[PDB]
Amino acid sequence: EVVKFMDVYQRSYCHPIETLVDIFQEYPDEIEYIFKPSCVPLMRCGGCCNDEGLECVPTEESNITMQIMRIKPHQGQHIGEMSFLQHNKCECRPK
Amino acid sequence: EVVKFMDVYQRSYCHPIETLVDIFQEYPDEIEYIFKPSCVPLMRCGGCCNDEGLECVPTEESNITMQIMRIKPHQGQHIGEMSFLQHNKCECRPK
């Protein structure tokens, strides 16, 4: 039941993890529409580095395409494809 | 390779997801120790709700105990057990 130190340490260290990301934060110019779902699951760098001076960031990226409902509030809605950036590799870098 | 609408929708909707959480956030009054790792993997509510005016919050929680390296700068460091809250169930609620 107690999680051992090296297990915690390896599981929390800087790496790509599935992250629920707000579409409007990825597409801030999309101001006249809302989306369903409003967030999407994306592999993104997360976790911590050995030193608080370091930052967990991507070194390899790729795209994925998802069907998202685009909604013009009270006017109409259409299911279309949208592309999102994912992170394939991360490392800890000075900030 | 296109993620289908109902797949994206079910995967992103409000639910417990592994989240890398800063220890100092969980223990904000801490002024003595720093921690390694500085973050821990915890099941936490995440994702989106049908109504954008709602937020994903826990309805059921439980503890997990992890071995953390507790460091007193210029004095020493000790592996000790620390507890963290995890979220077992979530629902969308008025923020």
From Swiss-Prot, chains A, B:
Glycans are attached at N63. Induction: By hypoxia. Regulated by growth factors, cytokines, gonadotropins, nitric oxide, hypoglycemia and oncogenic mutations. It comes from the Eukaryota. Disulfide bonds join C14-C56, C45-C90, C49-C92. Higher expression in pituitary tumors than the pituitary gland. It is linked to Microvascular complications of diabetes 1: Pathological conditions that develop in numerous tissues and organs as a consequence of diabetes mellitus. They include diabetic retinopathy, diabetic nephropathy leading to end-stage renal disease, and diabetic neuropathy. Diabetic retinopathy remains the major cause of new-onset blindness among diabetic adults. It is characterized by vascular permeability and increased tissue ischemia and angiogenesis. Belongs to the PDGF/VEGF growth factor family. This is Vascular endothelial growth factor A, long form. It comes from Homo sapiens (Human). The lineage of its organism: Eukaryota, Metazoa, Chordata, Craniata, Vertebrata. The gene is VEGFA.
